Request: fold
Amino acid sequence: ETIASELKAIGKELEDQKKEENIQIAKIAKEKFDFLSTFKVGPYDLIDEDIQMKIKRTLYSSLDYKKENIEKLKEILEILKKNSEHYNIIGRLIYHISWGIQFQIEQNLELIQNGVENLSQEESKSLLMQIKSNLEIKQRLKKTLNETLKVYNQNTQDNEKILAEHFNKYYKDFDTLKPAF
Amino acid sequence: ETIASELKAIGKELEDQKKEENIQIAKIAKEKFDFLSTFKVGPYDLIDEDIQMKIKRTLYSSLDYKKENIEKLKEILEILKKNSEHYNIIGRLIYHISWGIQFQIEQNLELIQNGVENLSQEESKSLLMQIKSNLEIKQRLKKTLNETLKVYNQNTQDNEKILAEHFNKYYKDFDTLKPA
Reply:
């Protein structure tokens, strides 16, 4: 039973994702468009570097580190933050999902660093399967966000049209303005 | 008849208006939301203090100097700026209209400062009438900016709804995401 050989490679696998996201994430730091570094869901929330680190990993990744889309994400978050009823749903995306995913990936990584030999054959199978699920989800998230960006873009868009139409109606000249009464 | 007396009064009236806006406008740069100070329509446009002054007068006035609505105006402008096809229409609002209005007022103000006596009787009638039109315009503009913000509010609104339901669909848990 050489599942060991498999796991050992699946590991060096995601341990690579981490080194290169670490870099891509560092650049964004001095390029000063890393909003997650100061992003709180509610007013007086405490901010843990390590917890935010995981969150940046999964959020900045699904956005291929593209400055623009990151800006757009920040805008969407900001907008939903306005209503307190949206706090919960935002946390699910930010914590239960974006952090939860990297948290899982850490425990998997550890199990391996601890020695795959020290694992049963039953366990060794689960772990591999478990890892695969995580890397599968990591994609669903990337796909999801893209649809989200699509939603926001389409909206900002309709707004543009609407606004422009109005302008051309009323701002052509003094005579296009609304009656004084 | 005493049109000269009327003229001279009307001039004191609007010269006061200026004085209070001058204050209210100073305050806004003090609280740092005077976006019109830096605003350019296109990339490399030159910015004249005096021309911007007039523009702030009419735009900040119609909005009633409220920071809430001034912010909203900035957002609308920003949004239309993206497309170059919107440059012209934005200028009409910013220049032809908002500056043009104060420019007219200035020339009227001058005519008076120069001496109403030095004016024909028919000339004096025009001026007075002309002034009145400008004041009316100012209102039509205020009435329109009010609609402009209405529209905007309803939009920001639909967006909110849309966004909120899209989250409470694809983000309840892992199970609710995007399948292959």
